[PDB]
């Protein structure tokens, strides 16, 4: 409603770096807000794509940003009559970024890994890896829970059970308020998908450079399965956290599986022990129900509500014809221990191939009326197809069915404006939460400042 579409702020990165593929707000030890930006195709030292991260200080004029440096060199360790190998070429460093406290977590889901033992090997596969940084202190650490040293022959004998070689850890990421990093790995367990959780503090204290294979005892991974409903489900394509069991001491996980049960798609709510509490099934096959998940209390009852995006949903139209437009689902948490019923509200896109619901960002309370609001992206929507971001306001019964404000892309065609979103943070300290929008196709980030209601 009260976002300013006239005076925007533009940050930019190198051409072709996909600057803006992922973003988040970052507060230093003094509470000063900055913008961490991932650029998963930034060039490295060997003039080859390795990804990169940028930490943008808040300036109303925007501009260029300094780099948050990480080690981009391939590593090799000969230990235990084996040869460990990391490969960072085309690893996509910055395909996901998240900030918690004064720590930044940037992940490379396509970092490859292999283990050589004489003539056998573990196979060169994308286990993924995440890089952790404390910018003020310079501390660095890594976390790659799916690295292993089991040779290829063993997996074949055991029918590829517990095969974490293609995890792509860091594909999606989130951090609980207690400081526990949760990584989505949609390729874990032979593309069933898995989750990897570990406290940030224990990642730093247990990491040493050059080890490549080290134990993080406090970590917790989800479990493999023989149920074909989970096969190729990409469990962990998206991840989020919230309170859904009524116990404020426990933190619940929200996991998206957009190809679950033969591309039906699903979203599951679990406890910290990966025990399933609820499961929301997709409405339409190949709609990618679960592509994006968001958690926020929109109706002001104190109970976190769930939003699920299905960007490829095909709406039924006249003459028995379907139209891909995308759809968002709203699930209001019931009072006390009860199951999440049918959707409370269905928001459906308008522009063909607009992919409404590709990203869903909680905005906090934008208009300061006592109800949290959200922003939904249609990266190829709008009458021109350049992209749109739609603001829906909260209310006592959930969300408004019509948008309060529409943000048209200021970028050219193909910018994927809205592919990444992040809100609920006041960056200029004016008392109103603001919105940052990524457009990796144009290698830029746009900042929308909230202003008093007119």
């Amino acid at each position: 409603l009260n976002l300013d579409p006239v005076q925007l702020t533009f940050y930019a990165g190198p051409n072709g770096s996909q600057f803006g593929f992922s973003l988040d707000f970052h507060k230093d030890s003094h509470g000063r807000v900055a913008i961490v930006v991932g650029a998963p195709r930034t060039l490295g030292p060997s003039q080859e794509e390795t990804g990169g991260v940028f930490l943008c200080p808040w300036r109303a004029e925007g501009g260029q940003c300094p780099s948050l440096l990480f080690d981009l060199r391939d590593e090799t360790r000969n230990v235990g009559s084996q040869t460990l190998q990391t490969f960072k070429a085309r690893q996509g460093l910055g395909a996901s970024v998240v900030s918690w406290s004064d720590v930044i977590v940037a992940c490379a889901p396509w970092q490859h890994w292999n283990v050589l033992e004489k003539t056998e090997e573990a196979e060169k596969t994308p286990v993924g890896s995440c890089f952790l940084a404390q910018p003020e202190s310079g501390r660095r650490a890594e976390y790659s829970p799916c690295r292993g040293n089991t040779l290829s022959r063993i997996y074949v004998e055991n029918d590829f059970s517990w095969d974490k070689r293609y995890c792509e850890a860091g594909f999606s990421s989130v951090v609980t308020q207690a400081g526990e990093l949760v990584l989505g790995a949609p390729g874990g367990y032979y593309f069933l998908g898995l989750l990897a959780q570990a406290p940030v503090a224990d990642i730093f204290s247990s990491y040493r450079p050059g080890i490549l294979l080290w134990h993080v005892s406090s970590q917790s991974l989800s479990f493999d399965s023989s149920n074909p409903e989970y096969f190729d489900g990409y469990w962990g394509y998206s991840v989020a956290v919230g309170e859904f069991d009524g116990d404020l001491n426990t933190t619940e996980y929200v996991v998206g599986a957009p190809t679950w049960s033969w591309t039906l798609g699903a979203v599951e709510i679990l406890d910290s022990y990966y025990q399933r509490l609820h499961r929301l099934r997709g409405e339409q096959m190949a709609s990618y129900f679960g592509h994006s998940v968001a958690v926020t209390d929109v109706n002001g009852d104190g109970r976190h509500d769930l939003l699920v995006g299905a960007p490829l949903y095909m709406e039924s139209r006249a003459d028995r014809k379907l139209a891909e437009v995308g759809r968002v689902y709203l699930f209001l948490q019931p009072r006390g221990p009860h199951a999440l019923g049918a959707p409370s509200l269905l928001l459906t896109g308008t522009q063909l191939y607009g992919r409404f619901g590709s990203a869903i960002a909680p905005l906090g309370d934008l208009d300061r009326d006592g109800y949290n609001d959200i922003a939904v992206a249609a990266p190829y929507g709008g009458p021109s197809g350049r992209g749109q971001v739609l603001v829906f306001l909260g209310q006592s019964e959930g969300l408004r069915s019509r948008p309060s404000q529409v943000l048209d892309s200021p970028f050219p065609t193909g910018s994927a404006f809205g592919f990444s979103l992040r809100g609920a943070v006041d960056i200029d300290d004016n008392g109103y939460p603001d919105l940052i929008v990524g457009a990796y196709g144009a290698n830029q980030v746009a900042v929308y400042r909230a202003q008093p209601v007119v």
Partner: antibody
Amino acid sequence: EVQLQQSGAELVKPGASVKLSCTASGFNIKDTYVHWVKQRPEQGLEWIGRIDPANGYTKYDPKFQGKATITADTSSNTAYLQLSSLTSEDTAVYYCVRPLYDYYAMDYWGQGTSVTVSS
Amino acid sequence: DILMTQSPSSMSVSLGDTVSITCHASQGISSNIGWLQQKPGKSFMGLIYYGTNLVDGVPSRFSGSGSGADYSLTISSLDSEDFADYYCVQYAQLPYTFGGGTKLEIKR
């Protein structure tokens, strides 16, 4: 806290067999590798072998191939070391070892089990 | 197998001295070495892993260094508890092999 609690001292005769144990305390035995080390005053320290309790796969120094047999039961959270056809040279102290962080390290040690072979 | 030559076999030193134990390997092991401590009539305690990294709980007066096939364990300002046995161990290749050992004795 990580503690490796081994069995009490054994006193056996030559030709017989003995099975030592290494129970994990404060952690899951399945977490890391579990090694076995032999110590003697003259010969010093010698590496017997290792086991991954998650799957049971083992490695051995070819010197101990035949006598040493390493196993593990995740239920009782314990790893074992069996010694067969015992000899006076098998009289030694036996330690179970696991790493801290590095997968291939030798950081945490049990108190050690004494073995004495004699007629 | 990799032979681990540890020297000296023993040394007579006093409190507060800065001593250095060395360990030579028959071939390069690329810092894949650990250091151990065995107090009199007791079990082992890990000091160093991967050549330089201190085990959690070990005082900072201990320190490891070296590269290739030559490494060193240094103890700055000896404490009354540091008088004990010390061994090096390589894990670059299987089987793991240990050094002969080094005993720190009180000088008088």
